[PDB]
């Protein structure tokens, strides 16, 4: 029952990995993986019983730590479908429109879709000019004139 130390670890690791698949949030993964590795280390190398828990906890911490860098390296410069999915303000950047009413004092409103958005520009622009969006502040859109 207790003469075999690695059996406990290689059982707990599997049980926690299984408990994941019940609808968890990934909390239990980081300890189950560490338990499996602790078993594969104790079975090969007879570490002290007081030297088992320390290694298991450190392995849990590194198990949680390594995938964060892996995933974060994957996300940047590689995946952009979700980045452009649920942020509208960045969607409107670069689009072109026309104006129906002249800007007074460098501020006004512009029609987008079926609604209107507030706009601000460096200089007063008359009615009927092609404009392009540069940046967004709050909900206000920066626009500048662009040639056709």
């Amino acid at each position: 029952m207790v003469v075999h130390p690695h059996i406990f670890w290689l059982s707990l690791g599997g049980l926690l990995l299984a408990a994941e698949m019940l609808g968890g949030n990934g909390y239990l993964l980081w300890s189950g993986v560490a338990a499996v590795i602790t078993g594969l280390v104790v079975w090969l190398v007879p570490l002290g019983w007081e030297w088992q828990g320390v290694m298991f906890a450190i392995l849990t911490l590194l198990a949680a730590w390594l995938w964060w860098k892996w995933l974060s390296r994957r996300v940047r410069e590689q995946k952009h479908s979700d980045s452009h999915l649920n942020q509208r303000g960045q969607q409107l950047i670069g689009r072109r429109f026309v104006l129906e009413s002249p800007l007074v004092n460098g501020r006004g409103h512009m029609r987008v879709g079926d609604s209107s958005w507030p706009v601000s520009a460096s200089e007063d622009l008359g009615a009927g000019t092609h404009v392009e969006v540069i940046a967004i502040e709050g909900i206000t859109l920066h626009i500048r004139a662009v040639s056709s």
């Binding site: 980081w30 300890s31 828990g53 911490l61």
Partner: protein, 102 residues
Amino acid sequence: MLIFIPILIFVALVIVGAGVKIVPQGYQWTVERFGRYTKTLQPGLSLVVPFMDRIGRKINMMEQVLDIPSQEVISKDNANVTIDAVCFIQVIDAPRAAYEVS
């Protein structure tokens, strides 16, 4: 030794439980460092150093239908009518919607 090991296991479980955050799609979260706003979490995996950072509020980022209760208005012809109205609200990714109004 005798009593350290269970405490160490429990401590590891608690730190991993309270330091790892996962954000669903269609939401954004905010991180407070002893109370001060510092950064916002997008949907994915996020590590925040525990016992100093906590979760401020949960911000929905999808268009929402908002009823406006019944209302009585007087027209320019001095006509008394009753109307009801509906609204669509969207939250731009700004954290302001959490801290600039109650």
